[PDB]
């Protein structure tokens, strides 16, 4: 029912999804989404590539069961200065101002997400999630999370994360939603076991296979960006180091120096760098899907580098945007060295 229309303008027949928001949107509204940055909206075209079946099932289930009502709660007190956009509204400023108010400013939500320093409310909301996830209500879970529930939260008394619970219950859409808000399939409970483990123990094998795909999402995406293939996780090899183009020539001295510098980063900083490279990959990839889906009109009429994430420093953001300066060969070199060392660091 809800799938027929854009969540942001009511425009018919939408082509993109905002995965973290569980909404389908049209092209125009997407073009504004892409400018907000992944920390606000994570965009993916619905028909251009195959999705993991259960990731798309999750987004479409969420949107058909009141996801948009969390984000538009205030509207549902109706005033003349706060009006939802209509399909024929100009992208600038009509649709844009609305979308930024919907998702960036969180203008229409029932209650804003608690401040990060709010330990007691964060804990309460998080214990609700860690219970709620056992059942199959995705709307409650998105609601809790929007309020500031933490998906990788560790229950001090029960000894487990929401992802453990969903996994032992076979709640795969829940697992999927939680992983979007960065739940970790590799986190051990107090008894030393991963959500992957609870899945297999429960006889939920596709979910187990899916959790492992989620574990390796970052490196899988980097490998695909250069090969058009991903590791075969059922085979047991979990990485895929693409070959460099200059493979017939000896490695140059600055290339060796660059990689030395990269290996020098602590695991924590390295994983931060890889998220950055992940984001740029996702940008360069979406750029091409954009040009492949858009009509000649819309294009010949966003941003040429990663959007600013306000929760990052000006330095972090500068490095992230510096990634757009990389030419194909430079970028491929960074991606290959990040892949071969993600592997090094895990053995």
């Amino acid at each position: 029912r809800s799938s027929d229309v854009c969540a942001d303008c009511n425009g018919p027949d939408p082509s993109w999804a905002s995965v973290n928001r569980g909404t389908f949107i049209c092209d125009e509204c997407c073009s504004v989404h892409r400018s907000l940055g992944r920390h606000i909206s994570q965009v993916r075209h619905l028909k251009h590539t195959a999705w993991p079946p259960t990731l798309l099932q999750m987004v479409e289930t969420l949107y058909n069961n009141g996801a948009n009502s969390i984000w538009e709660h205030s509207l549902l007190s109706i005033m003349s200065g706060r009006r939802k956009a209509n399909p024929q509204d100009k992208v600038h400023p009509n649709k844009a101002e609305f979308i930024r108010a919907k998702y960036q400013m969180l203008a229409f939500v029932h209650r804003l997400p608690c401040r990060e320093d709010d330990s007691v409310t964060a804990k309460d909301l998080s214990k609700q999630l860690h219970s709620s996830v056992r059942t199959g209500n995705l709307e409650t879970c998105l609601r809790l999370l929007s309020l500031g529930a933490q998906a990788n939260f560790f229950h001090p008394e029960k000894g487990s994360t929401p992802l453990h619970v969903a996994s032992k219950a076979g709640q795969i859409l829940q697992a999927e939603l939680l992983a979007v808000y960065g739940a970790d399939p590799g986190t051990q409970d107090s008894s030393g076991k991963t959500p992957v483990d609870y899945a297999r123990q429960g006889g939920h094998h596709e979910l187990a296979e899916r959790l492992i795909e989620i574990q390796y999402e970052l490196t899988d995406r980097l490998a695909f960006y250069l090969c058009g293939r991903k590791p075969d996780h059922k085979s047991g090899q979990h990485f895929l180091i693409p070959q460099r183009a200059d493979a017939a020539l000896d490695l140059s001295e600055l290339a060796k120096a660059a990689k030395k510098k990269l290996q020098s980063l602590s695991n924590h900083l390295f994983e931060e760098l890889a998220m950055d490279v992940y984001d740029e990959v996702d940008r360069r990839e979406t750029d091409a899907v954009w040009l492949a889906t858009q009509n000649h009109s819309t294009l010949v009429t966003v941003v040429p580098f990663l959007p600013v994430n306000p929760e990052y420093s000006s330095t972090r953001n500068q490095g992230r945007q510096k990634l757009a300066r990389f030419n194909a060969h430079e970028f491929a070199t960074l991606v290959i060295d990040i892949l071969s060392d993600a592997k090094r660091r895990q053995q």
């Binding site: 980063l265 931060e272 330095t315 972090r316 490095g319 510096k322």
Partner: peptide, 16 residues
């Protein structure tokens, strides 16, 4: 954060 971010930024500059 800044001491962490500055390490990342210098790795990135090494690849460009």
């Amino acid at each position: 954060a800044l001491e962490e971010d500055a390490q990342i930024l210098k790795v990135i500059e090494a690849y460009c």
